[PDB]
């Protein structure tokens, strides 16, 4: 979940569980050539590799073999008519590699 | 006296508490209720503790309540102990007499022409060249990487003779082993815990070197003592310890009997490298500890003169200079200084080579000395081969 306070884990404490997740992802078409088992997603900033793997295998039952992530910097070059820079949002993209061929 | 703690760096005592804490029956009104500091008030806080154990933030109990705390201090010799009066210190701590030359058995074993290596001088020169110049991509290998390499390569070179002597098959070279031997010595509880490079362990024990005649005749020898310096200097005096006289291998181990302990000087820095006398003392004490652990394992915990001595061998190397040692242990009683002493034939300062030029030293575009080892004594490797061949012939 995002924009929420995580309970602080103490040694021996219960398992952290999220029941109504706040993460929404987009399945984007790659802009370059990628291996046949590679699926490209656009995920929120606070999502991690483990979060996306568990998301995919729990909500869509998609077997996942690998996850890599990176942060794309949105352009802060466009100027408004008042010469104020317009910022395109930075986003996070993930490359997942499917599991069983 | 002069004390070494500058108070500009010491801890600062807390500012004196408010005078409201000196009025009986009057309860101060502080900022503990707002859970943050404010410049007008001040709170006393009880000491805090955790109801749960956390290993990343553990705090050990004070030393006196440790279960293994002993009122009398035991003196520990480990791999990093450097004795001041090294050789004499080791002889006193171990109750032993030193012999200048190596035993006659090993030299007789090596003097047989058929017992030599096929091309011994060339093989040893090649091993030196590989350890000192060829072993890495870097121009001049460091001691930390060329000492163990040269020793392991010499061990393999000697191991190559298994076909000529089909009795080296009952050996092995164990790494990451430890000895722990505790003995009383004039009411001084001494303990040696040794952890070095590698030990040759064989399925059979080494034959005794000295005879019972020499063992008996040793009883007139008097251990030299150094008055101003205690024999205990430069040993870790610890009050927390346990008395376990165990070796690194219990029953059922196929190679129980140690053969030779190899002691490396892996240190690029001279102050971190041991001096030759200190290294010799280190190998003397390590061999004594191995022999003592074996003696306790085989012949109980009694302090007695052994009818079957225990022989342990050792060699300490800087990478260029070698020191050889054959140690024979005859007694398990070491509090008294009058009985029969153990024996130690020690050979000191044996160069395998004098210098190595990793690059061609050039003076006015003409080479004066070529790339290779300058000076080479085959007798050092001959002693090495004899020590390896002691157990099997």
């Amino acid at each position: 979940a995002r924009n929420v306070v995580y309970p602080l884990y103490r040694l021996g404490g219960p398992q952290l569980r999220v029941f109504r997740t706040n993460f929404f992802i987009q399945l984007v078409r790659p802009g370059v050539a990628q291996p046949e088992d590679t699926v490209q997603f656009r995920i929120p900033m606070e999502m991690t590799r483990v979060d996306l793997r568990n998301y995919l295998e729990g909500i869509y039952n998609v077997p996942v073999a690998a996850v890599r992530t990176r942060v794309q910097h949105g352009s802060n070059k466009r100027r408004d008519h008042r010469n104020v820079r317009i910022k395109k949002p930075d986003y996070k993209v993930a490359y997942v590699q499917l599991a069983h061929g | 006296a002069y004390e070494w703690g500058v108070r500009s760096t010491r801890k600062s005592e807390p500012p004196p508490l408010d005078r409201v804490y000196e009025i009986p029956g009057l309860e101060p009104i502080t900022f503990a209720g707002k859970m943050h500091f404010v410049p007008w008030l001040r709170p006393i806080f009880p000491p805090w503790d955790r109801g749960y154990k956390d290993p990343r933030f553990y705090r050990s109990p004070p030393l006196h309540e440790h279960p293994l705390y002993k009122d009398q201090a035991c003196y520990i010799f480990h791999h990093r102990c450097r004795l001041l009066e090294g050789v004499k210190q080791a002889l006193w701590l171990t109750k032993t007499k030193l012999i200048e030359g190596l035993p006659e058995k090993v030299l007789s074993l090596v003097d047989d022409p058929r017992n030599h290596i096929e091309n011994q001088d060339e093989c040893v020169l090649n091993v030196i060249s590989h350890a000192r110049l060829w072993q890495t991509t870097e121009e001049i290998p460091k001691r930390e990487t060329y000492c163990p390499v040269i020793v392991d390569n010499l061990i393999q070179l000697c191991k190559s003779q298994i076909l000529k002597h089909p009795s080296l098959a009952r050996r092995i070279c164990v790494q990451n082993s430890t000895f722990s031997a505790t003995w009383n010595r004039e009411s001084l509880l001494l303990q040696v815990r040794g952890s070095g490079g590698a030990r040759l362990s064989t399925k059979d024990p080494l034959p005794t070197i000295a005879s019972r005649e020499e063992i008996e005749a040793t009883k007139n020898h008097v251990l030299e003592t150094f008055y101003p310096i205690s024999p205990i200097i430069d040993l870790h005096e610890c009050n927390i310890y346990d008395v376990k006289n165990d070796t690194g291998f219990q029953e059922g181990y196929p190679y129980p009997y140690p053969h030779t302990l190899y002691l490396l000087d892996k240190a690029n820095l001279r102050p971190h490298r041991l001096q030759p006398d200190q290294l010799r003392a280190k190998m003397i004490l390590f061999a004594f500890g191995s022999a003592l652990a074996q003696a306790r394992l085989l012949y109980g915990n009694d302090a007695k003169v052994l009818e079957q001595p225990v022989v342990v061998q050792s060699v300490g190397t800087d990478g260029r200079v070698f020191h050889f040692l054959v140690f024979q242990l005859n007694t398990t009683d070491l509090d008294c200084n009058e009985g029969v002493k153990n024996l130690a034939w020690v050979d000191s300062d044996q160069l395998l080579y004098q210098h190595f030029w990793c690059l061609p030293v050039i003076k006015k575009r003409v080479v004066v000395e070529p790339v290779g080892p300058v000076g080479f004594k085959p007798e050092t490797f001959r002693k090495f081969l004899a020590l390896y061949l002691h157990g099997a012939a």
Partner: protein, 176 residues
């Protein structure tokens, strides 16, 4: 499977998907919590597919078939979250008599303003928390003149606003 990031392949490039009636807060209150959870995940998958379609339409430089579907799903999930939060708030009020399930305190920071400081669930007590004891929740009153200046600036803005309202009303009455 990954086919759930896209709609029925018969709808691909069909320019219209006739569906609507996003969930109403009352209709979601009518349901139970397990049904709410399952419907939340259904709406989550639908929202993911709609976001995927929107991004792909942007890449292809074509209009989105029916963009109002995304708004309907978004507000339906917002209503579901509202219903769950309402039930939780009522239960917390009933059992502990509290709102604002994140503990906090009215404090006064280094600049002299009145803030609502939310707590941060540490593991050691605050009196030996070193980082926490570096924040200052007090004034040091060299800030009082700045407080008065900000108050006067607020008063000036408010007076300008009221005067402008008066002038606009006067003009409106002058014409009509």
């Amino acid at each position: 499977g990954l086919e759930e990031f896209f709609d029925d392949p018969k709808n691909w490039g069909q320019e219209k998907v006739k569906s609507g009636a996003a969930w109403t807060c009352q209709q979601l209150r009518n349901k139970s919590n397990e049904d709410l959870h399952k419907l939340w995940y259904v709406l989550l998958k639908e929202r993911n597919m709609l976001l995927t379609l929107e991004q792909e339409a942007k890449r292809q430089r074509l209009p989105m078939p029916s963009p109002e579907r995304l708004d309907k799903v978004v507000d339906s999930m917002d209503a579901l979250d509202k219903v769950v939060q309402e039930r939780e708030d009522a239960l917390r009020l009933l059992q502990t008599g509290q709102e604002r399930a994140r503990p906090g305190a009215w404090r006064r920071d280094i600049f002299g303003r009145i803030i609502w400081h939310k707590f941060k669930q540490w593991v050691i007590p605050w009196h030996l928390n070193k980082r926490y004891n570096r924040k200052r929740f007090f004034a040091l009153p060299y800030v009082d003149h700045f407080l008065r200046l900000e108050r006067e600036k607020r008063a000036r803005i408010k007076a300008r606003k009221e005067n402008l309202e008066r002038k606009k009303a006067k003009i409106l009455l002058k014409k009509f």
